[PDB]
């Protein structure tokens, strides 16, 4: 809504809010990102460190499908299964240890962040980390690798 904008309040003012000493010219400093090395160097060096220069190796034909590996933490692992499955745990006096498949929910890598409740689980994943496996073994479960 142009009604609520600033241009309506500037009617009658000569400079239109751009000063009368230094007028509003086309491009006093240049167009775009001009002058990153000269006359605009301080802004680039104090707000965008590492802008200039080249680092690392090139990868000509990079495909994101190969590097696709979603991760899930042990902090939220029972959320992938229904709540009644977790309710049917520490119960039945058998040690059921229901199987949790993370590839079904859309995860390949299992990370060890978070606290795992004291209940045996069967976790099947493409990859495992050392801490996650340690937590699962300490709780009383087992890690299963799936291709």
């Amino acid at each position: 809504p142009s009604r609520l904008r600033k241009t309506r309040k500037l009617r009658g003012h000569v400079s239109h809010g751009h000063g009368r000493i230094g007028k509003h010219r086309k491009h006093p400093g240049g167009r775009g990102n001009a002058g990153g090395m000269h006359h605009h160097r301080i802004n680039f060096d104090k707000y965008h460190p590492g802008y200039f220069g080249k680092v690392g190796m090139r990868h000509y034909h990079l495909k994101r499908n190969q590097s696709f590996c979603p991760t899930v933490n042990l902090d939220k692992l029972w959320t992938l299964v229904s709540e009644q499955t977790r309710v049917n745990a520490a119960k039945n006096k058998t040690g059921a240890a229901p199987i949790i498949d993370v590839v079904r929910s859309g995860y390949y890598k299992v990370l060890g962040k978070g606290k795992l409740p004291k209940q045996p689980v069967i976790v099947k994943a493409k990859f495992f980390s050392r801490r996650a496996e340690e937590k699962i073994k300490g709780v009383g479960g087992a890690c299963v690798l799936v291709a």
Binding site: N43, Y47, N65, V103
Partner: protein, 105 residues
């Protein structure tokens, strides 16, 4: 000119982009025309399915997905031979057939 920590942006508007602006006011008319054509085609083949020929079961490459199952282009010749359907006859009964698909598994 930069001013106190803004993003470094590189808009791609240095060509004569206003010459080749594509509006989408045709979208509802396009949808209506597509629906009318779909209904007419369905009416033309009264008992045949409106979707078309049956599609095979296909698993996706690119390990990213690696698990989803979608519809294929057509059944391979080995599948037709096992099922006992001639490749030339199959297309006349509503079965999609393509000869490029291999059979590894």
């Amino acid at each position: 000119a930069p001013s106190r920590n803004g993003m470094i942006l590189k808009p791609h508007f240095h060509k004569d982009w206003q010459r080749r602006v594509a509006t989408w006011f045709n979208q509802p008319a396009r949808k209506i025309r597509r629906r009318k054509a779909r209904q007419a085609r369905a009416r033309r083949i009264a008992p045949r399915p409106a979707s078309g020929p049956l599609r095979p079961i296909v698993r996706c490459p690119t390990v990213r997905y690696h698990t989803k199952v979608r519809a294929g282009r057509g059944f391979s010749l080995e599948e037709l031979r096992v099922a006992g359907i001639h490749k030339k006859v199959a297309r006349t009964i509503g079965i999609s057939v393509d000869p490029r698909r291999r059979n590894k598994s």
